[PDB]
Every structure is written in structure tokens, then in C-alpha cells.
């Protein structure tokens with residue numbers, strides 16, 4: 001079925017990077033229409049249109065309980081596509097956790113960790129590399145279900161390679177990046193596992209600003225480091241086993257999982273299939 005542009009009523013802006021807005025698809029014009037999440041380009045360049053269309057193809061091919069649901073495409077404006085998605089009412093996990101802090105216990109954090117793992121394992125079966133796994137890109141459906149959203153940086157692996165090489169990087173979440181992604185701009189399932197270790201760290205710090213991966217890494221390299229010098233010092237730190245600390249009150253077994261995801265050897269990092277099995281075992285034990 002189709003979405004006519006004239007019937008999409010703007011409600012609220014949700015986020016920018018592209019922009020995501022909350023809209024009501026209301027063709028009956030009685031405000032009884034479905035509330036949807038709408039992604040559109042803000043600077044619709046020919047390269048950005050090409051990437052956005054690929055992102056739409058990626059989302060549409062994915063059907064999993066922990067992946068935001070594709071609803072459609074609104075053409076009504078080909079050079080000005082609007083991606084229609086289900087609206088997830090509790091927002092990003094980063095905001096949700098920061099708002100409802102230790103009132104979410106370890107058992108609840110591990111239910112979210114398991115869902116993120118499962119979503120990521122399914123994404124890997126389609127040979128897609130997220131590249132931007134972070135709590136800000138994880139959305140909350142309700143208190144019992146989280147879903148990976150934002151496939152803006154997602155890449156499809158070439159047919160004959162287990163990595164994707166980014167020739168000209170744009171804005172990059174460097175404090176979530178694997179060493180090989182920082183040094184050689186190489187992205188793989190293994191670099192998404194390293195970023196997953198960082199998500200686990202974010203969860204267990206309860207999004208405390210002073211404990212954030214940029215705040216901790218800046219302190220370790222020195223707050224005096226600026227621009228490209230941050231990337232130089234971060235690479236040297238990671239190569240020398242400088243890691244994010246164990247969050248206050250974090251169980252030993254969860255910190256062990258983080259440290260295994262943060263292995264310098266790409267092949268030694270765990271698989272998302274084993275992480276989901278391990279996390280479900282911890283939850284069972286609790």
C-alpha cells in the first residue's frame with residue numbers, strides 16, 4: 001500500500017544526523033490516522049540519495065523482532081524519498097536508561113543486551129555491517145522490547161570479502177570503533193562485536209555522562225588532545241591494551257564479555273550467536 005505526502009501531518013522532530021520526525025498518516029483528515037516515524041534527507045545530494053535508497057533496501061529486507069519495522073516509502077515529492085517506519089514510543093535507549101536509571105535492574109539490562117545480540121546476529125546472516133552500534137541507535141518499543149534502528153551507516157559486505165573498507169570516512173563514532181576500523185577503516189561483523197562491547201559498557205554505566213566512552217577515553221589519552229591527534233593517541237592506547245574500566249557495580253561475568261569483545265585480534269572476538277547464548281545463561285542464573 002502507498003503513503004501520500006499530502007496526508008502526512010508533522011507532529012514533532014525526533015532526531016537529526018538526515019532527520020527523523022513523528023508524523024500522523026491521516027488521509028481521512030479527522031486526526032484518527034496512524035502515528036509513524038518518517039526519515040528524510042535534509043541535504044539531498046546525488047550521493048546521499050543513492051546511500052538513502054540503499055538504507056531503505058536494507059531496512060525492507062530485514063524482518064526480526066529486534067529490528068525497527070519498515071512500513072513504506074513516500075514518493076509523492078524520486079529525488080525526495082521519505083522512509084516510513086513504525087513509531088517506537090519510548091525513544092532511544094540512551095535517553096530511556098538515563099531517565100529510568102538503576103530502577104532498571106541488571107536482569108532488565110541483560111534482557112535488552114540479549115535482544116540487541118539477537119538483532120545483530122540476524123543482521124550478520126544478511127551480510128550487513130551496522131558500523132554505528134550505540135545505545136543512541138537502539139529504540140525502546142516498551143519496557144520488555146528494544147530494537148536496532150538507524151541503518152544510516154550500514155554497509156553490505158562484498159560477495160568475496162569478510163570486511164568493507166571505507167575510502168572516504170564522514171562523521172565517525174571513533175570511541176565505539178575497533179582498532180582496525182581506526183587504522184585501516186575496515187568494518188566487519190568482528191568490528192560490530194567490538195562496538196557491542198561498548199554498548200554493554202554504556203548499559204552498565206547507566207549512561208552516566210562522566211563515565212561515557214568519549215569522557216573515559218579523553219581522560220586516558222589526555223583532555224589536551226585535539227582533532228586528528230585524538231585518533232592518533234586512541235589507536236596507540238588501544239594497541240597497548242588501554243580499555244574502558246569496569247563500570248561501578250557491574251557483575252564480573254558481564255565485564256569479562258566486554259573485555260572479550262574488545263580483543264585486538266579480530267578472529268579472537270566472540271560471535272553474536274555465542275554472546276546471545278552466554279547472556280541468556282547469565283539471565284537464567286540470576
Ligand SMILES: Nc1nc(Nc2ccccc2)nn1-c1cc(Nc2ccccc2)ncn1
Nearest residue numbers: 014015020037086087088091092136149150
Ligand atoms: N522508528 C522510530 N521511532 C522513534 N521514536 C522516538 C525517537 C525519539 C524520541 C521519541 C520517540 N524513533 N524512530 C527512529 C529513529 C531513528 N533514529 C534516531 C532518532 C532519535 C534519536 C536517536 C536516533 N531511526 C529510525 N527510527
